[PDB]
A and B are shown apart, each in its own frame.
Chain A
Amino acid sequence: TRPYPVNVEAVYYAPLKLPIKYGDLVADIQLRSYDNENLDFYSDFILRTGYYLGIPLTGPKPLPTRRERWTVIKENFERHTHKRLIRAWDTNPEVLQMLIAYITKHSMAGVGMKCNFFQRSEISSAVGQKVLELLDSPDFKKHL
């Protein structure tokens, strides 16, 4: 009856991933949150954005959760840092900058992000500037 085109159908299914053709890692995106829900939702959204931008993205690799603990004297409190890793392959710098800009614009509450960019390339002092000033002062210049 009602046509539901492929873009809408894709929302109801796991995000598509483009195949990795050469295996040139061009960036890794680490997402961190003190909860896992927003983190994983945002990771799925990043995968969708990357697919449509033409970027091969492997997936939100689970990284070890960091636990912080505090004892109140015997009440125990703890904080969990959940971490996901999304790696990008075989992509130009400009498309990848577009990815980062778009996912920054539409980020979720409570999720931080670190981005490492790997750029293959062809082969081809405050104290010091004050120590000189002190040594060229009359108080120190008089002993020398």
Chain B
Amino acid sequence: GNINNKLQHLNNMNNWNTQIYNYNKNMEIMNTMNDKLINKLLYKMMTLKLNNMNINKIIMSKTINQHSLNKLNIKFYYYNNNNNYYMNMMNKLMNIMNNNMNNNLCNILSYYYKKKVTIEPIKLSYIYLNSDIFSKYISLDHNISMNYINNINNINNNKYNNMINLLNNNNYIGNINNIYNNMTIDNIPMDILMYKYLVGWSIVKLNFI
């Protein structure tokens, strides 16, 4: 769980559903309450139907409200379920989230918040990739760690070897291309990423490692 690396630890900011700091505490309390109310509204908005006997129940996680200085971004994960020539109901829902010209949801929310609002829906293809969605749906280890540790040791040793080779052949060592010789986006990122695999479950606590 390397804290110095953004692929190897969850940012502590992400363990709050409302991610905000306002110098004006009144406004911060108001924004927290707004986020809770909008989450309840969005939950109400995830059930659709194409006439009777055609009910469709999208399952969304809790919203993640990212408040920045000039914008709010409401990110949420969701789970759903010849097609090129019409729009199914879930597509219509998401398109009213952002893409409609006249009365899209983010403009109305922008008035509610008095700051720009965007909505970021993220589809999850399985239901056991998110404990919240898995719970809302069922309402209606050593070897992997060893491989991960081996990869981390290999990357560290690779950088060390690179740097000593530069020193052989102040603190500024040399050009970046040689300090990071075999250290590319095509091998390092996915090998250092954490929480790739579900290693345990208890039906709703999902353990990802």
Residues of A whose CB lies within 8 Å of any CB of B are 1-2, 4, 8-9, 12, 32-38, 81, 104-105, 107-114
Contacts and interface: CB of A to CB of B under 8 A. Distances in A.
| Chain A contact residues: helix, strand, loop or mixed | mixed
B23 to A, nearest CB: 6
A38 B23 contact: no
B70 A109 contact: no
Contacts of B101: none
Given A32-B21, A34-B16, A111 B11 contact: no
A81 B68 CA distance: 16
Given A4-B176, A9-B176, A111 B12 contact: no
28 contacts: A2-B177, A4-B175, A32-B23, A34-B13, A34-B16, A35-B13, A37-B12, A37-B13, A38-B11, A38-B13, A104-B69, A104-B70, A107-B68, A107-B69, A109-B13, A109-B20, A109-B66, A109-B73, A110-B13, A110-B19, A110-B21, A110-B68, A111-B21, A111-B68, A111-B69, A112-B20, A112-B21, A112-B23
Contacts of A37: 3, 11-13
A100 to B, nearest CB: 10
